[PDB]
Scaffold this active site. Sequence first.
Site, PDB file in Angstrom:
ATOM      1  N   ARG A   1      -1.718   8.527   2.052  1.00 44.11           N
ATOM      2  CA  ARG A   1      -1.287   9.700   2.867  1.00 44.11           C
ATOM      3  C   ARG A   1      -0.428   9.215   4.069  1.00 44.11           C
ATOM      4  O   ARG A   1       0.571   9.891   4.372  1.00 44.11           O
ATOM      5  CB  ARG A   1      -2.508  10.546   3.245  1.00 44.11           C
ATOM      6  CG  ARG A   1      -2.137  11.847   3.947  1.00 44.11           C
ATOM      7  CD  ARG A   1      -3.228  12.907   3.988  1.00 44.11           C
ATOM      8  NE  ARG A   1      -3.525  13.536   2.699  1.00 44.11           N
ATOM      9  CZ  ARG A   1      -2.783  14.468   2.091  1.00 44.11           C
ATOM     10  NH1 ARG A   1      -1.653  14.899   2.626  1.00 44.11           N
ATOM     11  NH2 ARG A   1      -3.178  14.971   0.934  1.00 44.11           N
TER      12      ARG A   1
ATOM     13  N   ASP B   1      -7.755   7.354  16.152  1.00 42.54           N
ATOM     14  CA  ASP B   1      -7.960   7.240  14.678  1.00 42.54           C
ATOM     15  C   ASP B   1      -8.361   5.819  14.290  1.00 42.54           C
ATOM     16  O   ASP B   1      -7.900   5.282  13.297  1.00 42.54           O
ATOM     17  CB  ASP B   1      -6.699   7.742  13.979  1.00 42.54           C
ATOM     18  CG  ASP B   1      -6.891   8.097  12.509  1.00 42.54           C
ATOM     19  OD1 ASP B   1      -8.042   8.184  12.073  1.00 42.54           O
ATOM     20  OD2 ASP B   1      -5.834   8.294  11.848  1.00 42.54           O
TER      21      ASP B   1
ATOM     22  N   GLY C   1       0.809  -1.222   0.000  1.00 42.89           N
ATOM     23  CA  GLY C   1       0.000   0.000   0.000  1.00 42.89           C
ATOM     24  C   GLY C   1       0.839   1.266   0.000  1.00 42.89           C
ATOM     25  O   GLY C   1       1.941   1.303   0.598  1.00 42.89           O
TER      26      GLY C   1
ATOM     27  N   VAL D   1       3.386   0.820   3.070  1.00 46.38           N
ATOM     28  CA  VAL D   1       3.518  -0.440   3.825  1.00 46.38           C
ATOM     29  C   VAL D   1       4.102  -1.464   2.869  1.00 46.38           C
ATOM     30  O   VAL D   1       3.593  -1.570   1.696  1.00 46.38           O
ATOM     31  CB  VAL D   1       2.180  -0.874   4.422  1.00 46.38           C
ATOM     32  CG1 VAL D   1       2.325  -2.199   5.143  1.00 46.38           C
ATOM     33  CG2 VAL D   1       1.599   0.181   5.379  1.00 46.38           C
TER      34      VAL D   1
HETATM   35  C1  LIG Z   1      -2.215   1.298   5.786  1.00 49.42           C
HETATM   36  C2  LIG Z   1      -2.749   0.270   6.760  1.00 49.42           C
HETATM   37  N1  LIG Z   1      -1.710  -0.629   7.367  1.00 49.42           N
HETATM   38  C3  LIG Z   1      -1.563  -1.987   7.151  1.00 49.42           C
HETATM   39  C4  LIG Z   1      -0.523  -2.434   7.887  1.00 49.42           C
HETATM   40  C5  LIG Z   1      -0.148  -3.887   7.914  1.00 49.42           C
HETATM   41  C6  LIG Z   1       0.357  -4.476   9.030  1.00 49.42           C
HETATM   42  C7  LIG Z   1       0.593  -5.832   8.948  1.00 49.42           C
HETATM   43  N2  LIG Z   1       0.312  -6.570   7.897  1.00 49.42           N
HETATM   44  C8  LIG Z   1      -0.181  -5.925   6.844  1.00 49.42           C
HETATM   45  N3  LIG Z   1      -0.423  -6.676   5.767  1.00 49.42           N
HETATM   46  C9  LIG Z   1      -1.075  -6.413   4.599  1.00 49.42           C
HETATM   47  C10 LIG Z   1      -1.333  -7.481   3.726  1.00 49.42           C
HETATM   48  C11 LIG Z   1      -2.003  -7.356   2.583  1.00 49.42           C
HETATM   49  C12 LIG Z   1      -2.502  -6.134   2.134  1.00 49.42           C
HETATM   50  N4  LIG Z   1      -3.210  -6.068   0.946  1.00 49.42           N
HETATM   51  C13 LIG Z   1      -4.370  -6.963   0.814  1.00 49.42           C
HETATM   52  C14 LIG Z   1      -4.878  -7.038  -0.660  1.00 49.42           C
HETATM   53  N5  LIG Z   1      -5.399  -5.722  -0.987  1.00 49.42           N
HETATM   54  C15 LIG Z   1      -4.321  -4.734  -0.911  1.00 49.42           C
HETATM   55  C16 LIG Z   1      -3.658  -4.723   0.472  1.00 49.42           C
HETATM   56  C17 LIG Z   1      -2.257  -5.031   3.019  1.00 49.42           C
HETATM   57  C18 LIG Z   1      -1.572  -5.175   4.183  1.00 49.42           C
HETATM   58  N6  LIG Z   1      -0.461  -4.601   6.823  1.00 49.42           N
HETATM   59  C19 LIG Z   1      -0.011  -1.334   8.567  1.00 49.42           C
HETATM   60  C20 LIG Z   1       1.066  -1.168   9.450  1.00 49.42           C
HETATM   61  C21 LIG Z   1       2.347  -1.825   9.256  1.00 49.42           C
HETATM   62  C22 LIG Z   1       3.372  -1.577  10.116  1.00 49.42           C
HETATM   63  C23 LIG Z   1       3.165  -0.640  11.195  1.00 49.42           C
HETATM   64  N7  LIG Z   1       1.953  -0.022  11.383  1.00 49.42           N
HETATM   65  C24 LIG Z   1       0.997  -0.291  10.542  1.00 49.42           C
HETATM   66  N8  LIG Z   1      -0.721  -0.211   8.229  1.00 49.42           N
END
Ligand SMILES: CCn1cc(-c2ccnc(Nc3ccc(N4CCNCC4)cc3)n2)c(-c2cccnc2)n1
Length: 295
Positions: free
Chosen positions: A16, A132, A13, A20
């Site tokens: 804003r 948030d 991703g 990630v």
């Molecule tokens: C922006 C939201 N976010 C997701 C994660 C996060 C934290 C841990 N694991 C994942 N895994 C993840 C796996 C797949 C997707 N995709 C799924 C298919 N569609 C697109 C996105 C997105 C995130 N995301 C975090 C994060 C990370 C580190 C520290 N603080 C926050 N923020």
Amino acid sequence: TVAHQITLLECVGKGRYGEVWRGSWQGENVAVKIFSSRDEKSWFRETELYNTVMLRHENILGFIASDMTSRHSSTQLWLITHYHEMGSLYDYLQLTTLDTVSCLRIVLSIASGLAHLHIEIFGGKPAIAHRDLKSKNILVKKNGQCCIADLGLAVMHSQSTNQLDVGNNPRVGTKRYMAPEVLDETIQVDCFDSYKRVDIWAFGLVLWEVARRMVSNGIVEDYKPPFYDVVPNDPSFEDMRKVVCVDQQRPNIPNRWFSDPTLTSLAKLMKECWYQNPSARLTALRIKKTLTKID
Ligand SMILES: CCn1cc(-c2ccnc(Nc3ccc(N4CCNCC4)cc3)n2)c(-c2cccnc2)n1
């Protein structure tokens, strides 16, 4: 000697919030958040919290490390956590419908993480409000429970000192999920309880988003974000204040819920998260107990 030990494999991703990445550390998947340059204060606050507080719970995103590193020859701020392959609740709810058991497992797990944040433990963590909470900040784990992430706006309170620690962060909440008292700037900023009541408002919105995706009588709503019918994508402060403070609008309870017991119990909870009077809202602990009881 933390960033150096990690390989960025894929960007899952960009927004804003920064970026990630799925990364490997000792050949294990980790999530790496790379903060936008405008947002050192969120990195600083999250690193401060996860380093200074014993912040570890099934339903809170598991911290591994925070580091600073150079790339494209400038400073990047990294937060490194457990990797949840399913991704966010927001994305999960678009790609799938829920049965009674999976809807309840989701919302109980969110209540359990939020109650863990909101409670002071002695002997140990201060009370913490999130400020948030939203479906995009909640991750779905492989057991079908959720975990809360994004502590960069968090506020803390200690009974020892009766000190409220509000930090120094010019970032504000996601506008779509802001309680009425935030939008109209009446929130009582010196009372810790004000911040916990803002989280209950947001939790109510997330409960609504999830319940819409539970199958009853063979039918289900499409995923929609809260207030989808009255504000645009990327709503403004004014868009939201008109809707929530002036018109005093709330998300609609669909008609097909009202003859289902689970969804009638969920619709009750969400209305009691949405009182315009913050003092009247349920607590996270009351929400967790009630969801523990539902069938
Ligand atoms: C922006 C939201 N976010 C997701 C994660 C996060 C934290 C841990 N694991 C994942 N895994 C993840 C796996 C797949 C997707 N995709 C799924 C298919 N569609 C697109 C996105 C997105 C995130 N995301 C975090 C994060 C990370 C580190 C520290 N603080 C926050 N923020």
